[PDB]
Design an enzyme around this catalytic site. Sequence first.
Site, PDB file in Angstrom:
ATOM      1  N   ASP A  57      72.820  13.722  59.570  1.00  0.00           N
ATOM      2  CA  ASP A  57      73.873  14.750  60.323  1.00  0.00           C
ATOM      3  C   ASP A  57      74.783  14.768  59.067  1.00  0.00           C
ATOM      4  O   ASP A  57      74.879  14.169  58.014  1.00  0.00           O
ATOM      5  CB  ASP A  57      74.287  13.722  61.243  1.00  0.00           C
ATOM      6  CG  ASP A  57      75.665  14.333  61.785  1.00  0.00           C
ATOM      7  OD1 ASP A  57      75.635  15.280  62.329  1.00  0.00           O
ATOM      8  OD2 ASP A  57      76.640  13.728  61.386  1.00  0.00           O
ATOM      9  N   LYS A  70      74.687  10.183  44.720  1.00  0.00           N
ATOM     10  CA  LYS A  70      74.572  11.574  44.308  1.00  0.00           C
ATOM     11  C   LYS A  70      73.319  12.179  44.959  1.00  0.00           C
ATOM     12  O   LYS A  70      72.735  12.798  44.072  1.00  0.00           O
ATOM     13  CB  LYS A  70      74.614  11.456  42.911  1.00  0.00           C
ATOM     14  N   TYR A  89      75.193  24.955  64.189  1.00  0.00           N
ATOM     15  CA  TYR A  89      75.246  24.377  65.449  1.00  0.00           C
ATOM     16  C   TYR A  89      76.849  24.156  65.774  1.00  0.00           C
ATOM     17  O   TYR A  89      77.506  24.137  64.982  1.00  0.00           O
ATOM     18  CB  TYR A  89      74.565  23.271  65.863  1.00  0.00           C
ATOM     19  CG  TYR A  89      74.599  21.848  65.303  1.00  0.00           C
ATOM     20  CD1 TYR A  89      75.900  21.040  65.987  1.00  0.00           C
ATOM     21  CD2 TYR A  89      74.230  21.565  64.103  1.00  0.00           C
ATOM     22  CE1 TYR A  89      75.955  19.801  65.258  1.00  0.00           C
ATOM     23  CE2 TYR A  89      74.726  20.323  63.511  1.00  0.00           C
ATOM     24  CZ  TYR A  89      75.344  19.598  64.322  1.00  0.00           C
ATOM     25  OH  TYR A  89      75.628  18.359  63.355  1.00  0.00           O
ATOM     26  N   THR A 114      78.289  10.545  70.052  1.00  0.00           N
ATOM     27  CA  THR A 114      76.848  10.567  69.676  1.00  0.00           C
ATOM     28  C   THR A 114      76.718   9.194  68.621  1.00  0.00           C
ATOM     29  O   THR A 114      75.595   8.479  68.700  1.00  0.00           O
ATOM     30  CB  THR A 114      76.411  11.976  68.784  1.00  0.00           C
ATOM     31  OG1 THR A 114      77.432  11.796  67.392  1.00  0.00           O
ATOM     32  CG2 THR A 114      76.854  13.028  69.467  1.00  0.00           C
ATOM     33  N   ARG A 118      79.366  10.584  62.909  1.00  0.00           N
ATOM     34  CA  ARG A 118      78.345  11.733  63.107  1.00  0.00           C
ATOM     35  C   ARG A 118      79.410  12.986  63.196  1.00  0.00           C
ATOM     36  O   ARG A 118      80.564  12.641  63.408  1.00  0.00           O
ATOM     37  CB  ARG A 118      77.532  11.666  64.385  1.00  0.00           C
ATOM     38  CG  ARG A 118      76.210  10.599  63.708  1.00  0.00           C
ATOM     39  CD  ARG A 118      75.208  10.128  65.177  1.00  0.00           C
ATOM     40  NE  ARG A 118      74.663  11.580  65.516  1.00  0.00           N
ATOM     41  CZ  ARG A 118      73.411  11.560  65.951  1.00  0.00           C
ATOM     42  NH1 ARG A 118      72.946  10.367  66.230  1.00  0.00           N
ATOM     43  NH2 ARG A 118      72.844  12.850  66.416  1.00  0.00           N
ATOM     44  N   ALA A 120      79.487  16.127  65.197  1.00  0.00           N
ATOM     45  CA  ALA A 120      79.886  16.643  66.545  1.00  0.00           C
ATOM     46  C   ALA A 120      80.450  15.395  67.410  1.00  0.00           C
ATOM     47  O   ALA A 120      81.408  15.703  68.163  1.00  0.00           O
ATOM     48  CB  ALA A 120      78.849  17.292  67.076  1.00  0.00           C
ATOM     49  N   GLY A 121      79.977  14.228  67.253  1.00  0.00           N
ATOM     50  CA  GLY A 121      80.301  13.108  68.011  1.00  0.00           C
ATOM     51  C   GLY A 121      81.434  12.280  67.621  1.00  0.00           C
ATOM     52  O   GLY A 121      81.999  11.569  68.283  1.00  0.00           O
ATOM     53  N   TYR A 189      72.965  12.762  70.724  1.00  0.00           N
ATOM     54  CA  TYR A 189      73.573  14.014  71.601  1.00  0.00           C
ATOM     55  C   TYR A 189      72.963  13.784  72.958  1.00  0.00           C
ATOM     56  O   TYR A 189      73.770  13.853  73.845  1.00  0.00           O
ATOM     57  CB  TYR A 189      72.920  15.266  71.187  1.00  0.00           C
ATOM     58  CG  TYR A 189      73.011  15.707  69.604  1.00  0.00           C
ATOM     59  CD1 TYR A 189      72.246  15.689  68.754  1.00  0.00           C
ATOM     60  CD2 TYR A 189      74.624  16.029  69.338  1.00  0.00           C
ATOM     61  CE1 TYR A 189      72.449  16.051  67.457  1.00  0.00           C
ATOM     62  CE2 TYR A 189      74.797  16.437  67.845  1.00  0.00           C
ATOM     63  CZ  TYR A 189      73.722  16.457  67.042  1.00  0.00           C
ATOM     64  OH  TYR A 189      74.159  16.852  65.744  1.00  0.00           O
ATOM     65  N   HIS A 250      71.620  19.453  60.326  1.00  0.00           N
ATOM     66  CA  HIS A 250      71.274  18.376  59.823  1.00  0.00           C
ATOM     67  C   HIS A 250      70.396  18.818  58.571  1.00  0.00           C
ATOM     68  O   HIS A 250      69.773  19.929  58.816  1.00  0.00           O
ATOM     69  CB  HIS A 250      70.573  17.544  60.644  1.00  0.00           C
ATOM     70  CG  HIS A 250      71.471  16.605  61.812  1.00  0.00           C
ATOM     71  ND1 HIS A 250      70.724  15.936  62.518  1.00  0.00           N
ATOM     72  CD2 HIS A 250      72.581  17.140  62.033  1.00  0.00           C
ATOM     73  CE1 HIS A 250      71.659  15.395  63.735  1.00  0.00           C
ATOM     74  NE2 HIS A 250      72.761  16.341  63.245  1.00  0.00           N
ATOM     75  N   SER A 256      69.122  14.131  43.267  1.00  0.00           N
ATOM     76  CA  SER A 256      69.495  15.301  42.654  1.00  0.00           C
ATOM     77  C   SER A 256      68.900  15.623  41.206  1.00  0.00           C
ATOM     78  O   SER A 256      68.936  16.551  40.431  1.00  0.00           O
ATOM     79  CB  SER A 256      71.272  15.451  42.406  1.00  0.00           C
ATOM     80  OG  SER A 256      71.847  14.244  42.060  1.00  0.00           O
TER      81      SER A 256
HETATM   82 FE   LIG Z   1      74.957  16.354  64.194  1.00  0.00          FE
END
Ligand SMILES: [Fe+3]
Length: 322
Positions: A57, A70, A89, A114, A118, A120-121, A189, A250, A256
């Site tokens: 996420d 990294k 989203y 969530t 995270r 959104a949560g 979620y 996500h 890298s």
């Molecule tokens: Fe998320």
Amino acid sequence: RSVQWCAVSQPEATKCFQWQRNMRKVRGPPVSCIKRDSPIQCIQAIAENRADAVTLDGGFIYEAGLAPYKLRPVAAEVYGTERQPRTHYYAVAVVKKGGSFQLNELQGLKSCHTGLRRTAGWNVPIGTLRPFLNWTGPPEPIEAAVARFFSASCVPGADKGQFPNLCRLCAGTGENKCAFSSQEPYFSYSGAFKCLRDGAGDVAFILESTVFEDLSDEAERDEYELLCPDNTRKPVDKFKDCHLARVPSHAVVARSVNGKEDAIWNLLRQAQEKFGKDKSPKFQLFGSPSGQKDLLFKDSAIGFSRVPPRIDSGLYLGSGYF
Ligand SMILES: [Fe+3]
């Protein structure tokens, strides 16, 4: 050789081996499985070459991109449908219809998140709510400030001992209570939405599609609405005009340097074609056993979109906003 996927829980490890067996059965690119107990453990496992990829996420894509790890996002989950695909989203605040409190009046109420850190949560909501908190800033843990804001919450992953209020509403039994895993029924979620549906909390900080996907009877959708950042409440289908933020999906991250990006992408491309949405009935890359939450990939993901070269975590996340 062979891409080594990292699981953050036993149930994910189990799905990974099932994924592995099926790839072999259909004679597609192989995938090895490494088991750990948290996102941060997979991040370091990858950094020290004990694993190659893990889906994260935004809040963890950020932590993964910081030294000494990294890590960089190499593949993003896609949502929506084949006709209307999206690599983003919306974080929303869902509540029960009937109430009158607005986004700026959550002081003293019950919340469902969530998981700790995270997007959104936690990051977006606690970020949007800072002006209403009495946070004295570091060295004070932001957790203490929210734990004294909401009367009680379920924030999977929070320390049950330091901030019990943040875990009091969680449904896990025993040590599973407040777990940052499927052990906790209110995790992620779908879990946070259940925390609201069950009446444990007054608000849930999740994404726009949860209500529509989790209700087997569309008539039950009429029981919910959203809290808009302009202090008004609107229907759940008006998320575009009523969200706290629009963020990038996500994403799978890798080293890298010598991260095996080409191989990882080939695995995902092939896994998507054979076990993606509505492909094989024997195994679903995007699906989790009953009660399990978003194992390896979001249960709502429908595919992948490759991230062009030289794009680190910062650039990738820069697509989001409050
Ligand atoms: Fe998320």
